[PDB]
Design a binder for this molecule. Structure first.
Ligand SMILES: *[C@@H]1O[C@H](CO)[C@@H](O[C@@H]2O[C@H](CO)[C@@H](O[C@@H]3O[C@H](CO[C@H]4O[C@H](CO)[C@@H](O)[C@H](O)[C@@H]4O)[C@@H](O)[C@H](O[C@H]4O[C@H](CO)[C@@H](O)[C@H](O)[C@@H]4O)[C@@H]3O)[C@H](O)[C@H]2NC(C)=O)[C@H](O)[C@H]1NC(C)=O
Ligand SMILES: *[C@@H]1O[C@H](CO)[C@@H](O[C@@H]2O[C@H](CO)[C@@H](O[C@@H]3O[C@H](CO[C@H]4O[C@H](CO)[C@@H](O)[C@H](O)[C@@H]4O)[C@@H](O)[C@H](O[C@H]4O[C@H](CO)[C@@H](O)[C@H](O)[C@@H]4O)[C@@H]3O)[C@H](O)[C@H]2NC(C)=O)[C@H](O)[C@H]1NC(C)=O
Ligand SMILES: *[C@@H]1O[C@H](CO)[C@@H](O[C@@H]2O[C@H](CO)[C@@H](O[C@@H]3O[C@H](CO[C@H]4O[C@H](CO)[C@@H](O)[C@H](O)[C@@H]4O)[C@@H](O)[C@H](O[C@H]4O[C@H](CO)[C@@H](O)[C@H](O)[C@@H]4O)[C@@H]3O)[C@H](O)[C@H]2NC(C)=O)[C@H](O)[C@H]1NC(C)=O
Ligand SMILES: CC(=O)N[C@H]1[C@H]([C@H](O)[C@H](O)CO)O[C@@](O[C@@H]2[C@@H](O)[C@H](O)O[C@H](CO)[C@@H]2O)(C(=O)O)C[C@@H]1O
Ligand SMILES: CC(=O)N[C@H]1[C@H]([C@H](O)[C@H](O)CO)O[C@@](O[C@@H]2[C@@H](O)[C@H](O)O[C@H](CO)[C@@H]2O)(C(=O)O)C[C@@H]1O
Ligand SMILES: CC(=O)N[C@H]1[C@H]([C@H](O)[C@H](O)CO)O[C@@](O[C@@H]2[C@@H](O)[C@H](O)O[C@H](CO)[C@@H]2O)(C(=O)O)C[C@@H]1O
Ligand SMILES: *[C@@H]1O[C@H](CO)[C@@H](O[C@@H]2O[C@H](CO)[C@@H](O)[C@H](O)[C@H]2NC(C)=O)[C@H](O)[C@H]1NC(C)=O
Ligand SMILES: *[C@@H]1O[C@H](CO)[C@@H](O[C@@H]2O[C@H](CO)[C@@H](O)[C@H](O)[C@H]2NC(C)=O)[C@H](O)[C@H]1NC(C)=O
Ligand SMILES: *[C@@H]1O[C@H](CO)[C@@H](O[C@@H]2O[C@H](CO)[C@@H](O)[C@H](O)[C@H]2NC(C)=O)[C@H](O)[C@H]1NC(C)=O
Ligand code: NAG
Ligand code: NAG
Ligand code: NAG
Lengths: 481, 482, 484
């Protein structure tokens, strides 16, 4: 007689995963699906990262004297440090919109235009904004005051004869007293009107004392205007006008701005976070919900294990609640007890089928990467109300939905992996049973008892699939009965 | 002796779908789940579609002379063309999008005239920039009041809401270009308009200054609106620069909206409208446009998604073990028998019907029929604004990504389950057939049986029907086997 | 000879569930996953609920005379009733919703009085529209400054922030109805109010004009607010039309919110609060309201979702097995054996298969979906007036969220039902296959889920088969002789 047993491998150390029907199940192999660490540095490749050391984007746009190294710059990502400061006092109504559009433009290209201001004096300065040892001002703005003892009505025009949009930055000066207002501007109540063929803005200055900032009790408000090709710009002013010196060329692209204190190093990475660059070889990440580039999706979980092997079962006997830790050639194989001696082999068909069905399984459902460049703000330092609440709500909803998606996907994939491995083992056992028609009996433990003399060539023929039952039919029948 | 095999059908040409464990598997039949084309026309049934032609909704509401055919109009969807223009006095609307959305969602342009009394001022002002034929004109729903004689008295009027519906009032403020013009039109050197109710107020101070010429005018007019709830009162107080209203608009709650499109409108029936045109809604997903009106499929980024309908296509007596039957056209599963009389073939109705019933209506168990949406947010912009536009784009992008993921995962899961159920059906039929033949037959290794007793056509039909009796032939089969 | 059968239990009354491959399938047990009812009452534990009664949050903050009981109050949820009204000077708040949300999220009404000096003006002005008992009054947290004698000097005051917490200041501007009233109350013919810090500024010019009478007044007051960070300074500059502040509000960070409801408040314990009332959170989904506070189930559009708990239900039709036949007489377990012998029929139960099925079924839904989500302050979801862009965006966001979560719930229920049915069927088949494996050549299956054994198999034999210590070599010769 002879014995033939079928089984599967085992490893000394398994990994616990979670499926649809099991809280904890041990498998031979698993992989991590969530990235939860960073090196703390920002790669300067392949994206173009511009470090604004002590300057904000608005300050560099306006022309702060200590921000003059940023003139005519361009970037893919602008990094704003927490140690930035202003050294020139002003306020911007709707600051966030201007900051966002300047960041999304991706450039600081400024073209000077020849404005004519007749009857007034130009190039005013203050001691609060020093350009060297002398008084200065913003380099992209012009402070106009009275000439002699008169301040006439200003009325200038400039058409857009190009084929791209223009961006104009202008301002209004708010004095602190009526005496100062009349001293700088002869009229007791100024007025600034800037309009195009389709839009208009009129600002009336406000007079009143304010806290001293670098020695000044007055302020300046900043406004902007966009002129389409074929349109025209008209500026009408009675006083308190901070005239523009030109226009900014505005483009459309994939630029943005980020707040971070991580240093920038010479390295390559496609994903940038405020914590630093992270690899994008995993479908999910847990570092930061603020990202730039090709980045994994953000989830609330810190670990998600995906099974890449069959069950780990501790240990002649077959595969019925028994693993073979002595198998290193393949996933499934045969063991036989013969007159010549015991032997072991491996089956390549089932092993390769399982490997093919396992490899690349996650790519069939979830896409590889998503490239997002400019998005909404997700951290705030001041309380505002309605819009901030809406933004926070949207971000929270997105995060919760994606976390649920990740959890369900991982559970389903683990369940299907376990099912396919079990099906492969059972199919191999059933094929082996079907090949031996009447010459063998099932021993009850995944093994077969062959009732005729089956030598090594016989076992090899059984394993190959070229076994003939008619050769040993009568001998097996005589032995069985 | 005899032979009884089991098998399944196959087709000369199959389709490749994707499952959970397979990236490409061939099946006998599949259907497309994504709609990706349109005819370029807009159906005027069953929704009421109003063509704006050369007019916008705001211009038609104000009373533009070339938009006078749109007075007292009704619509379910308003279509705005890119060739629309303005031909009246230049104006601007602060928060234009909010008023446009309000008027579009109201769904009607019904106007009721009221008896306003303006004592001491001139009425019915006009300009050469807004012509009613050969003579000067103005917006038909607004009244331009200027000085009478040499005085402009203080205007203070009231109007109560004694109905049971909301009232919408449209008024304006005139911004002159020079101080001399301001003094000439209105005696006072600084005008002021105050419009208020018992719960809200608005005060506007005009701005004097030159502006680019538009149809010969360097002055502008700003447009404002006020809503008066039932039982409330409206008070208008002014001393210059008032563009008075002539009445109120009825404002309703409904399912109306507005769209920007250039597709023509033709006689046809469709429940879904896109800027590209009308599309059928028989499929659960679409790829034409993310701007939709009516009962429409969900927008996904995928161009195609195939759902499996049949079984695995296996190319071609032998059984079902890696062998499909090309010559079978009468069913999905059946029998082939080899006998002394000759060969034959049949089909199994029960297993085929079970598989068909399981397959039929498979996708309706999860996805709702249709999502009918009428008024939504704007999804395309022609000018950069900032915060709110970014928020809207972010919301739309998140929605699109989530629904694309849902569609992909669902299609993969359904294909996997269809393949599994069909394989289980075939294996169950074979197992039952083996179960009937207790000891008179044994499996030959290729999904087919070898019978050791003389089993004729009546015998084969008895086996197929499920009424086979092994006791009659047991002794002969046992003698043949041993 | 002896007969051995395998089968499963069934119940007289079943319940219908929905799976991936079946529209309507009957099982032995199921549970409801959607909470669609409420008691109509709000529990005051464990959250601190503050009833607004006839006052709103803004009215309580300003100092309305009939809202004077809400001074220095704290809350976790503020409940605003539909019967609230105002009984003081008419006013309007530009961007009212932002201030309401700010005060609701702050969670307290703590007020600290500060010593402002207003030189050359008369303080503590009142009106007949706001009565403190028999006499004329005003808001308790605001100061109405008017001319003293025949002059109104320019006011310029400062107040530094020397603490380590943010300050909130509430002030206002008065809008007269006539120029004569403007001149009588304030000497200057045009007022101006400037309030600023080192990083912000606000200037308001009053409006003049008649308005509808509210409690005898055709004038209004506009409300503005300012926040001062630690180390900053506040400056107020004005020459008329100023409603001065009396101090600052302590502003905090926390998990407080506000809700509009008309449900009464009783003594009970509940972790979730809805405008309909409190609901239990023992289910993953609910259908009551999309406005919630606390640990609440997710909101879905469906009103019922049944999760299968048992196996398929098959009516019971010489003993028979599990092939299209249930056992209504089995109450000892899920799977078992039935044997007919010469001594008589017998029945038993199998514990391992039943225990495995129960352990797989138990706790199945906790593996994918989280228990509860704690949300405290969110966006508004109901509006009493039409506004335009922002309201449309909020409605769109809420509708998208609801649709996505409803789809998730439906798909999850269907998948779980399918897997439960599959696991029960697999367990029964595995038990039958093991029973076949034990009897190698001594019996053959009859096809109805039963084995009939050729040798003599008594109670010891049947018990050995059930346990698993059955030996086939003992009866092999007798079985072979009987079969052939
Ligand atoms: C309306 O009300 C506001 C606020 O109440 C007033 O604003 C104040 O204006 C005064 C000037 O009139 C400001 O005083 C100035 O402060 C400067 C900064 O002081 C800070 O820094 C120094 C050094 O670091 C510290 O010692 C000090 O404590 C502060 O922390 C000083 O540098 C100025 O000095 C100048 O004047 C002195 C006078 O002796 C000279 O000796 C000096 O050489 C120098 O010339 C000056 O003292 C004050 O800071 C303002 N306060 C605020 C909050 O802004 C308005 O003046 C008031 N308007 C009217 C019309 O009344
Ligand atoms: C403040 O600054 C602004 C802009 O700098 C000034 O606005 C300009 O005002 C002048 C008039 O004062 C405008 O000139 C007018 O332009 C009309 C349109 O011009 C277009 O069309 C004509 C004909 O097709 C073309 O030839 C031309 O190139 C343009 O393409 C003309 O139709 C007007 O014609 C009138 O004047 C002529 C003079 O010869 C007469 O013969 C005509 O019959 C007719 O009466 C006129 O020329 C100019 O367009 C305005 N510019 C802008 C940008 O709007 C303000 O006037 C100024 N304010 C002060 C107080 O100085
Ligand atoms: C600009 O235009 C507006 C609106 O047209 C005017 O506002 C009106 O001003 C008048 C003048 O005061 C107001 O009249 C007063 O109304 C009070 C309330 O009346 C309501 O309530 C009573 C009782 O509940 C009802 O019977 C009545 O129908 C109203 O529903 C009255 O109580 C006042 O009575 C006083 O005067 C009478 C005079 O005989 C005395 O007998 C009384 O004892 C008492 O002293 C008074 O009649 C009117 O309410 C205002 N309407 C609105 C809508 O605001 C502005 O006045 C106007 N401005 C200018 C400069 O012209
Ligand atoms: C363009 C201009 O007028 N520049 C002035 C500037 C302004 O007058 C002021 O900042 C606007 O509010 O002020 C400068 O400072 C002045 C002192 O030099 C002078 O002694 O006193 C003035 C006040 O009475 C004023 O502070 C400055 O800021 O440097 C002078 C500069 O030319
Ligand atoms: C209601 C009214 O006053 N209408 C005027 C109109 C206005 O005066 C003006 O548009 C407001 O800015 O202007 C009209 O045009 C005028 C010419 O006819 C006149 O020769 O010159 C005027 C300038 O000095 C003015 O342009 C118009 O727009 O048709 C006349 C109309 O009655
Ligand atoms: C702080 C103050 O001035 N308070 C006045 C108040 C105001 O004058 C008014 O409400 C602001 O618009 O008005 C009071 O009412 C007055 C009557 O008592 C008086 O007979 O007539 C006045 C009109 O000419 C005015 O209505 C009030 O509202 O009680 C008096 C209060 O001291
Ligand atoms: C990445 O940086 C963020 C900073 O935004 C870290 O999140 C903060 O972590 C600290 C310390 O636990 C908390 O006190 C803050 O509340 C967190 N902020 C937010 C917005 O969550 C985060 O821990 C960092 N992650 C890694 C891996 O370095
Ligand atoms: C329906 O119309 C839209 C117009 O928005 C088409 O989308 C544009 O397609 C062109 C050509 O590929 C692109 O260059 C644009 O970028 C697309 N615009 C947007 C906003 O996506 C769309 O292709 C049309 N679809 C059909 C089926 O005609
Ligand atoms: C909980 O209260 C809400 C209040 O909005 C109820 O929803 C309204 O129910 C009425 C009556 O059927 C409808 O006419 C409204 O259209 C509903 N409003 C909304 C926004 O859906 C809700 O039915 C209540 N729930 C329970 C269980 O009583
Ligand atoms: C486990 O799987 C990973 C990839 O999924 C593979 O690289 C690794 O070799 C596997 N483990 C073993 C022991 O082969
Ligand atoms: C393929 O399936 C569709 C159902 O989507 C059916 O209408 C069609 O008849 C099927 N094809 C064949 C050849 O049966
Ligand atoms: C059905 O299941 C519930 C819990 O899921 C349990 O409380 C109940 O007893 C079960 N019903 C029966 C008849 O076992």
């Amino acid at each position: 007689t002879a014995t033939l047993c079928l089984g599967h491998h085992s490893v000394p150390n398994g990994t616990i995963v979670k499926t649809i029907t099991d809280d904890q199940i041990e498998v031979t192999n698993a992989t991590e699906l969530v990235q939860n660490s960073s090196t703390g540095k920002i790669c300067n490749n392949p994206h173009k990262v511009l470090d604004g050391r002590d300057c904000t984007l608005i300050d560099a746009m306006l022309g702060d004297p200590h921000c003059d190294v940023f003139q005519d710059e361009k970037w893919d990502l602008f990094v704003e440090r927490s140690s930035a400061f202003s050294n020139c006092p002003y306020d911007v109504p709707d600051y966030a919109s201007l900051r966002s559009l300047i960041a999304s433009s991706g450039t600081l290209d400024f073209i000077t235009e020849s404005f004519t201001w007749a009857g007034v004096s130009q190039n005013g300065g203050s001691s609060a904004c020093k350009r060297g040892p002398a008084n200065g001002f913003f380099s992209r703005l012009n402070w106009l005051t009275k000439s002699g003892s008169s301040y006439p009505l200003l009325n200038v025009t400039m058409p857009n004869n190009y084929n791209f949009d223009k961006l104009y930055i202008w301002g209004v000066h708010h004095p602190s007293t009526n005496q100062e207002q009349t001293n700088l501007y002869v009229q007791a109540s100024g007025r600034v009107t800037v309009s195009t063929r389709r839009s208009q803005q009129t600002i009336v200055p406000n007079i009143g004392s304010r806290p001293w900032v670098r020695g000044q009790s007055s302020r300046i408000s900043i406004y902007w205007t966009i002129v389409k090709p074929g349109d025209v710009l008209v500026i009408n002013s009675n006083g308190n006008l901070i005239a523009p010196r030109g226009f900014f060329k505005i483009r459309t692209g994939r630029s943005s701005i980020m707040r971070s204190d991580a240093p920038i190093e010479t390295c390559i990475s496609e994903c940038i976070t405020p914590n630093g660059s992270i690899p994008n070889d995993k479908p999910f990440q847990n570092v930061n919900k603020i990202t730039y580039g090709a980045c994994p999706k953000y989830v609330k979980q810190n670990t998600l294990k995906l099974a890449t092997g069959m069950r780990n079962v501790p240990e002649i006997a077959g595969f019925i609640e028994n693993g073979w830790e002595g198998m290193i050639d393949g996933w499934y194989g045969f063991r036989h007890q013969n007159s010549e001696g015991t032997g072991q082999a491996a089956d390549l068909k089932s092993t390769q089928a399982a490997i093919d069905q396992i490899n690349g399984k996650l790519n069939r459902v979830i896409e590889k990467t998503n490239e997002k460049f400019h998005q909404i703000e997700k951290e705030f330092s001041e309380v505002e109300g309605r819009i901030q609440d809406l933004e926070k709500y949207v971000e929270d909803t997105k995060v919760d939905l994606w976390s649920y998606n990740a959890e369900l996907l991982v559970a389903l994939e683990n369940q299907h992996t376990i099912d396919l491995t079990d099906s492969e083992m059972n199919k191999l056992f059933e094929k082996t049973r079907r090949q031996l028609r009447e010459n063998a009996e099932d021993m009850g433990n995944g093994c077969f008892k062959i009732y005729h003399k089956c030598d090594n060539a016989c076992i090899e023929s059984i394993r190959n699939g070229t076994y003939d039952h008619d050769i040993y039919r009568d001998e097996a029948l005589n032995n069985r009965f």
